[PDB]
Amino acid sequence: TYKYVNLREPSMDMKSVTDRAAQTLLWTELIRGLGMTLSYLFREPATINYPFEKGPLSPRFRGEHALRRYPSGEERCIACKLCEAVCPAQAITIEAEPRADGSRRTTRYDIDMTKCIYCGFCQEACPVDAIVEGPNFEFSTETHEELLYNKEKLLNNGDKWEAEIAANIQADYLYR
Amino acid sequence: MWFEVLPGIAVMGVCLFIPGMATARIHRFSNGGREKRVAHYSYQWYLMERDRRVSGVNRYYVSKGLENID
Amino acid sequence: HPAAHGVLRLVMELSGEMVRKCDPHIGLLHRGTEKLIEYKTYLQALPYFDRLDYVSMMCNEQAYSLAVEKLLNIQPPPRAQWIRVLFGEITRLLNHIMAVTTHALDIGAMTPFFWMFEEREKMFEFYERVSGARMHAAYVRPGGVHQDLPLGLMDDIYEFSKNFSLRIDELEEMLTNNRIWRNRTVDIGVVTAEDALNYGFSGVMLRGSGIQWDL
Amino acid sequence: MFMINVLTLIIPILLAVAFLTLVERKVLGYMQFRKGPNVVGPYGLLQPIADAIKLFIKEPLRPATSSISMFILAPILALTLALTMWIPLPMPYPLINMNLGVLFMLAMSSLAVYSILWSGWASNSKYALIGALRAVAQTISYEVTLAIILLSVLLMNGSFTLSTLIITQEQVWLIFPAWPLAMMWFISTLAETNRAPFDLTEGESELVSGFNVEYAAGPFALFFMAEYANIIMMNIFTTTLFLGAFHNPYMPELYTINFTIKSLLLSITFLWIRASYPRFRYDQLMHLLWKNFLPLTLALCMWHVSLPILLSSIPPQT
Amino acid sequence: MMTYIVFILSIIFVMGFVGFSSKPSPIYGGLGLIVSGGVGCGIVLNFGGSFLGLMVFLIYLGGMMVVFGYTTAMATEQYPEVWVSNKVVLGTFITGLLMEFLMVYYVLKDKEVEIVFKFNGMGDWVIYDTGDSGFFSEEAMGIAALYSYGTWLVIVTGWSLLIGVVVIMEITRGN
Amino acid sequence: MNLMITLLTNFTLATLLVTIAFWLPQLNVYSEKTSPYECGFDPMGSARLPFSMKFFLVAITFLLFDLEIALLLPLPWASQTTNLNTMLTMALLLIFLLAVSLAYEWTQKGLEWTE
Amino acid sequence: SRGEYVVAKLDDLINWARRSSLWPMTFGLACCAVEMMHMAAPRYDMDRFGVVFRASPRQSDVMIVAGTLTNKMAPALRKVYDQMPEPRYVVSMGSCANGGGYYHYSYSVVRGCDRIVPVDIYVPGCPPTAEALLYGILQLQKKIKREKRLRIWYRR
Amino acid sequence: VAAFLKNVWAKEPVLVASFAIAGLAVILPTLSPYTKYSLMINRATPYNYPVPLRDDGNMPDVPSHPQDPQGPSLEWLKRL
Amino acid sequence: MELLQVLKRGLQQVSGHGGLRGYLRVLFRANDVRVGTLVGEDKYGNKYYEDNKQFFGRHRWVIYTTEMNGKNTFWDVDGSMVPPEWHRWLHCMTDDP
Ligand SMILES: CCCCCCCCCCCCCCCCCC(=O)OC[C@H](COP(=O)([O-])OCC[N+](C)(C)C)OC(=O)CCCCCCCCCCCCCCCCC
Ligand SMILES: CCCCCCCCCCCCCCCCCC(=O)OC[C@H](COP(=O)(O)OCCN)OC(=O)CCCCCCCCCCCCCCCCC
Ligand SMILES: CCCCCCCCCCCCCCCCCC(=O)OC[C@H](COP(=O)(O)OCCN)OC(=O)CCCCCCCCCCCCCCCCC
Ligand SMILES: CCCCCCCCCCCCCCCCCC(=O)OC[C@H](COP(=O)(O)OCCN)OC(=O)CCCCCCCCCCCCCCCCC
Ligand SMILES: CCCCCCCCCCCCCCCCCC(=O)OC[C@H](COP(=O)(O)OCCN)OC(=O)CCCCCCCCCCCCCCCCC
Ligand code: SF4
Ligand code: SF4
Ligand code: SF4
User: Fold this and answer.
1) Is 1.20.120.1760 the CATH number for E4-171?
2) Which residues from chain D sit within 8 angstroms of residue H32, using beta carbons?
3) Which residues span the membrane (chain B) (predicted)?
């Protein structure tokens, strides 16, 4: 259940001693390292040509957040506050009130992207599949306050990436 | 692939081809179509000075042949 | 400093170049984790362990999950245990590639870094396929694992584990037989067995000193 | 007219240094399973231009605790010595045909160390002092063995003139009868220019940058082009010493092409060595040349001084 | 004024000697001695001894580099004096340069000077020889005759160097 | 004539590349940028303190050895003399004395570093 | 005017030289430095774009704050940013270097690196992937490209 | 002495090679028969002018013309 | 032998981009001149190509348009200029365009 790494005893005979002396005076293993670098010179490099050649991903990828809708126009969230209660970094702030038709809908839904750790607790604690973690990751901003998403930005992101979010959910909903 | 290191290296080749041959061309221009004569020892310098004095133009590469004598 | 692992302040008293005293000042990355863990629930403090050892994520996840399951008097299903062990060994490959390649980089061999970071990227792709995030997976939870494997992952792991032996062979051809690599490591940092035991050393520090001990 | 000759000598070597930066980056990338710069232009031909224009529009950053006069004099001396020591090399006709060009190159290679030393001492920093003292240790490690190697390999040439070295190798290469001296000379040229695995002065692992850690852009580029011109000159010097090509007095372009491709292969071998080996410790390099190279160099010097007398093969001095 | 090239080089030689003999700090003393060795090898190279000049240049560069390593190691100060940080050093440097240029002005006026010997004012190009030297330089054959003729000199010099190595071993021992 | 012209040309080309690097760009100097760099923290002590060296013995050995091999440099020209046996004997004696001195340094632990 | 065209072309040239020769500094703190090294991996290959790490701040162009900037580290980061020569850019990457991330309410964590150093590009994520960091680097290059230094100097 | 030679060849081959090269370089020129060839090759090289002698009347060994058969010839050097 | 086959493949890569002008355009815009099957084109002008003979990660690529939402994007290409329906296929998240 164990092996004696680096305990081999070197030989003593004249041929092996002459071989070791020849390797000492002629630097054989340095030539071996040179040959390995020369072998790596003639391979196909694994470099992709960004931004024309994106790296492979998965349908389960966690990126920018978005708010979904039912397939009739109604927003999915009913302000149950499970996501802000399960968010470990407290990035989600929710304030709700009954709207004109008496439906339990949000009034403030803020996600601080600089607080968010992108772990998908909100997208897995949502009972109505409202909040999702979309596949977008190219959304870096030049200003700090642009990473403070309110409800309007999240709804616009959902309307922008619904055609991909629906397909990803249809792909991955049977594992949940 | 690997052969794309061959363009830039080739530029290096041009960057190592320009100077030295240029000196040879310079040595073929000032010295009248011959090599620039070397003077490692004082006998060669004395022959250089004798040639410069005997040319009559104060240029040592102006070679005067056997038609000069009677 | 490129030599220090990110944040580390060695105040070193030197006799010219030979070290006479080393004082490692730390705390430049003290985030105060184990108070905010007390200020959060168990599931909320589960992603805290992904960032302690940021090259051994699912190992720390498995440690925290084993502690919570021991306190809860429950056990995970066998398939979850096998998934956890397989991904722990993948994580061990990640950490050991990181250790050997970075150590050779500070010694001076910068080429096996680029040789093995491709395999590191492939294991990160496996992480992303199984959890959705490349490093901080938050995959291993008390009670098993969060989600099952996507189909076709086992074959990709099989192909990668088929070629990784040749990758290790290339690395060992590069570094082990080299005389310059030996001259920096043959008689540097010799630690006896008793001094390793009394200093709280664990893992390879014991196993490099002849002490037969594996958890 | 000599102004034209000296400018056509010194401008293409600067262009060669810049394209050597390009070739170094791209070849070193390709040996590490990746690609070099190819986005700046067509196959990255404009990367050295971007680097050179970028470095000469940045701030110089002269420190307050540094002696400014030596801080300015040291990179000037480095670039100057890198420039006026390319001259005695025959290409196939040298610009300056010195009778004692070998000793001239030895003396000006000994002089170029002082630029590193005064750069380390002038900028008041501990890492710069460590780099300067490591340069001192490297010099006392390599210099005597380098000089004895050159003396032992010049016993077959006849004299110290670099122009007559082509005539010596007109029949056969000088690497055939002096290959141990050739290997020891190659290691000496590697350790002379502070190239890997004997960097030890611009050590980015043990130190941050070494002697040029306080040198910001503008003066920092001077050390870079001095080092790269130095490695090209060592490659050309080794090619002339041990790989003498066929010279036709009517067609010097044949010799120019031959030693150009040979020096290119030698620089490729330099970068081949750079990517594959860990860095030596600077006390192990000190015991490398003084214990392994030096006794063999002394024995080979006695062998090469007793050989031509033994064989009636003493070369002429004219 | 190109005929006085050796005289100008000798002026720079005494200038460097004044520069490092005022003893400001051994770094700048080493720099001054490097400059002095360079112009001295230029002088002797102008007289025809190129080998001797190159040899003394190489030897003194190596010696000054070992010296600089020693002063960085051992002979150092918190605030080294460049040339003007000390009043006495700057003063004696100024009077050394003033005396040198006064001697230059006096010898460049009547072409004669009396400092304890008697010296002319013409350039040294007059004292050269007018004939050639054949196919050899005299200095090269002269130093090459060290082994064919100077056996006693070689023996005593090799013994002195070996004894010097033994002496260096014995002195820096401590017990 | 040509050597000083080449020296002056190279010196001028070197010294022009710093005054171009100085007077061209926009400079902004404050009393925090030009501090000595010690990895983000201010250093302890000065850089002019005594830097205790270890290889002083090998430095003195190099001081002797540089010129003691510079005695061996006219050995090419010494092969052109008529008296050859004496030259060969003296050269072999010189390099033998060099080898004896090196072996005496090696055996007495002189090449090892202090502390 | 011809002078306006001349200063516009010179501004374009210097912006091209500065944006195609970015020299970041080897400076990481945490997880996001591991992702930065994965951006330096052969797959993404930052050295294609002229991006090459430099150890010293005096020979560096940009600084990438990758990790958590704690209270004990902030003077060191400020001095390191101060020692960099102009022009200098800072790319803030990761949630820790943006707004504190997981450790926003911790006692010894600076809530974002904006409080210490001026920031050009904010890269969100935990960690933001090597593709995302390369996208942020390209966005910084685009920001450098549309600089108007010599045009404003001619107008002023 | 075979055991000592094998041990020192296994431990430090560089010193063994250096001592063997040194021993050959010391003891070999005294064995080769070509050292006198070097001697007369070095003595036969005309650095200086061969200043003639006055013909007193009895000098049978020196010639009057360089093409005369009397004198030191170098057909051996042309042959070698 | 196989060298002139490499030369023929290079000449075919030159000819497959619409001639020399298209070759230099795609070289100076994308830094990669390998041809591929035209899988698709969106409403903004971006072209999407696939070549499954290349290794994984290089088998799908996009040539961006020169005009997107009123902006001259001849040189300043962006990774966020891909519509989501093609962003699924480009990032290897599915096998169906
Ligand atoms: C110019 C032409 C090309 C030259 C080669 C260039 C390409 C190859 C480059 C390879 C990579 C080099 C990277 C740097 C390596 C640095 C380390 C290094 O060089 O260490 C040297 C090492 C040093 O050894 P070491 O560092 O292992 O030290 C061993 C120390 N002990 C023993 C105490 C453990 O080897 C040498 O010094 C050998 C020098 C060359 C020897 C040549 C011998 C020729 C044959 C002689 C005769 C033999 C037969 C016996 C006598 C017969 C008589 C008739
Ligand atoms: C010893 C040999 C040394 C060799 C050194 C040089 C090696 C490389 C040689 C050149 C190789 C090709 C370089 C091509 C650069 C890019 C050219 C280009 O496309 O520029 C486009 C750019 C913007 O133009 P835009 O208005 O957008 O175009 C509309 C398009 N529908 O427009 C511009 O940028 C403006 C035009 C720029 C043209 C630059 C041309 C190359 C200059 C290289 C400098 C050195 C030249 C040679 C010097 C030595 C010989 C004299
Ligand atoms: C403050 C810091 C320093 C600032 C200034 C730095 C200036 C540059 C410093 C680096 C260069 C130092 C050069 C030192 C002298 C080198 C001499 C040399 O290169 O000689 C080569 C050659 C010898 O060959 P030879 O055998 O004489 O051939 C004659 C037969 N054809 O010679 C010839 O062929 C003869 C050619 C003419 C020689 C004229 C006489 C010598 C000129 C010396 C100039 C001044 C050198 C000052 C060195 C200062 C070093 C710090
Ligand atoms: C007469 C011949 C010519 C002699 C004069 C010319 C010499 C040319 C070469 C010069 C060499 C200079 C340096 C010599 C140093 C010898 C002393 C020495 O250092 O011995 C130590 C070594 C054992 O190593 P260690 O003690 O560990 O060393 C410390 C760090 N390595 O100890 C050893 O390894 C043992 C060394 C002594 C035994 C060597 C045997 C070599 C045999 C070669 C084949 C036969 C040659 C016959 C000629 C006579 C040889 C004596
Ligand atoms: C009165 C008329 C004259 C007025 C004075 C002005 C004289 C000329 C000044 C220099 C040239 C100005 C124009 C510079 C380029 C402007 C256009 C530009 O920015 O093109 C961008 C293009 C690369 O586009 P990019 O955004 O990188 O594309 C993404 C890739 N997928 O870029 C390219 O394709 C490459 C651009 C190359 C630019 C030319 C080459 C560099 C400069 C060489 C000459 C100067 C330096 C000489 C050598 C100095 C020492 C090394
Ligand atoms: S992904 Fe996690 S950290 Fe981010 S908002 Fe959702 S629950 Fe909070
Ligand atoms: S968990 Fe879902 S339904 Fe509940 S408040 Fe959050 S987004 Fe709305
Ligand atoms: S943002 Fe996340 S990945 Fe980056 S350093 Fe902070 S905890 Fe680690």
Assistant:
1) no
2) 310-311
3) none
